[PDB]
Subunit: 203 residues, 4 copies
């Protein structure tokens, strides 16, 4: 079963995300014109493959299962980024602290280019699970693979669950770096766009 393997990988990603101190969250993959996504409320350690929720191309979820309350901005990510095959959302503490300040992460480290440019954006607040929040997410992901969400947390998407988790972890490292330096020096020194342009091509 294709679905069983993917659901197993979603759970592995969830358990791994908590093990790395990154998780609250939700994880999905692109699947058959819709998505497979974690359900609402169930702790990761209690997830079984059976509990993963399919949402079709119309937003109708499987019968008898309640998908993540934030499935709508997973759908927004997939519609915005044709290259996204997996989406990771969490409230990692350093990411979320930066999002409380409503600041993008600037080019403080060359690994910022892993999200596609010279920044991690911070999308404006809207209530979790709403269409307003979805639209902000779609805009933020137009030219970036990851974005902060003001007063909320982090969305990262990539071509595989492993890469989306890796990118989510990388943005959390970037956030910790930014908080640690901002506490000493405001503004934090950044690399110029020429430096990032060079790195972007090397990637």
């Amino acid at each position: 079963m294709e679905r069983n393997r993917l659901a197993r990988q979603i759970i592995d990603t969830c358990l791994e995300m908590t093990r790395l101190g990154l998780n609250a969250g939700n994880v999905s993959v692109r699947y058959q014109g819709g998505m497979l996504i974690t359900p609402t409320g169930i702790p990761y350690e209690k997830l079984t493959e059976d509990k993963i929720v399919f949402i079709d191309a119309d937003g109708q979820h499987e019968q008898g299962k309640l998908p993540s309350s934030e499935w709508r901005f997973h759908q927004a990510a997939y519609q915005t980024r044709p290259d996204a095959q997996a989406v990771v959302h969490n409230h990692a503490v350093h990411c979320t602290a930066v999002s409380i300040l409503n600041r993008p992460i600037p080019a403080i480290h060359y690994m910022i280019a892993a999200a596609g440019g010279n920044s991690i954006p911070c999308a404006p607040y809207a209530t979790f699970g709403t269409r307003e929040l979805s639209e902000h997410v779609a805009v933020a992901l137009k030219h970036r693979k990851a974005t902060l969400l003001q007063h909320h947390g982090l969305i990262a998407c990539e071509a595989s669950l492993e890469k989306a988790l890796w990118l989510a972890h990388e943005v959390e490292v970037l956030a910790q770096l930014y908080l640690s330096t901002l506490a000493i020096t405001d503004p934090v020194p950044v690399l110029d766009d020429e430096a990032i342009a060079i790195v972007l091509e090397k990637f």
Copy 2:
């Protein structure tokens, strides 16, 4: 044995609380008109189900066992909140640092609503184990499921041990968020009461 299962769950919660970096503390459940609570002095890794202490409705503990020195504010929690079935107290480092500043945690993140409102209160100091401390705790828990204790730590109560531990962990995340942002910006941006009102209903 009903009591053996509950005592096993109390110990599991304790061991899990230390594994999450949250513990010093004490854990109880509502039971037969009194409570089952961890004993004083015994490290969690040495607790056996036999060592859990029953305190009856009058405050008389089981013969030959010394309950947690802070059992009185577990009793205060149960008397104040009829919906509380489990109480978790710890000195989690971020919670406790905020409590040293004698500040409530404000609405810096929408998950603040998990404790019932727009804030985590910080009750005024009184000596651990005293009636004065119990009264402060009762007042703080009137409209909130968790509270900081000035110069002390954190109390969280919920409908199950798993939910009380989850809430305790959530407040520690909120505290870390507050400390991290306060070090950059004072005051920290907050969501307004309309935003929290919306979130409270979604819960």
Copy 3:
């Protein structure tokens, strides 16, 4: 063998100290008029009971074994505190950061009383392993069970290895609390001596 059991417990304490993120360090017990102490240079994960070093009452170590380079301030602790049966020294990061500022930890939390008073002292710097450093340590431990060492780290002593490790961990928590609050507010609010006097008696 009495010595084999004690050496096994020293190693367990060392491995546990690193597991708690507290270790560089050295651990000893009072033994037969001298001490058993970790050797110099050997990583904790490579220690075998055979490698623990006996130092007699005169400072002569066992033949063929090199004791910890800081054994002299373990000896100072044992001579200063007749109640000390075990000594833990480490360079735990929060303790050591406070010691770099050459500040005592004040009464920011009632658990400060576990070291015997209203403070964790910070002894003045002297080169590791020297007599000058030993004398500073002896003075600092006169009325306290633990002390910081300026530009260095932490010494904690108690009636058992388990209690000395517990106290070392408690001082590291106190140090993290102090650093976290000092970054927001200088000076940090403290409990007054009446409050600590009450707590000291409850202990």
Copy 4:
């Protein structure tokens, strides 16, 4: 096979480096006039001994394997330091935050002498994998066994993989100490050169 044992030790070092929260990175040993080094892109948990890459004395890597994109500054380290047998590079978060400020780590703690002097230098930025970056690294390592790399991370080299990992971990502790104290007091108190001179000889 000599190579199989060394490649096994490289992988063990990598897995251990991530377990200590220090890793992105790359690890090598001096070998047969060139080096054995981790390959590019492969996560440490997926490395097999077969995947370790030999680079000869000329910079020609083994056929069919792509060495770490930063192999050139491993080569720079080996050419600069005849005593280096192993090189560890990572983006440990505290090291990297200090490198974003473009500050050396000064003599805030006597263990700074483990890198050979009174400081951890911070080499000026250049694009990862370039000759310009290699030259900066060579200069920084002339009189030091470890160096920060501006906007990048940390390089540490020593006589064995175990010692290079130990030194890398020690510099990360020093960096965390510096950040923690700098957030309170700028500049941070340091030991004078006489104190470090004494420690250097004791080593």
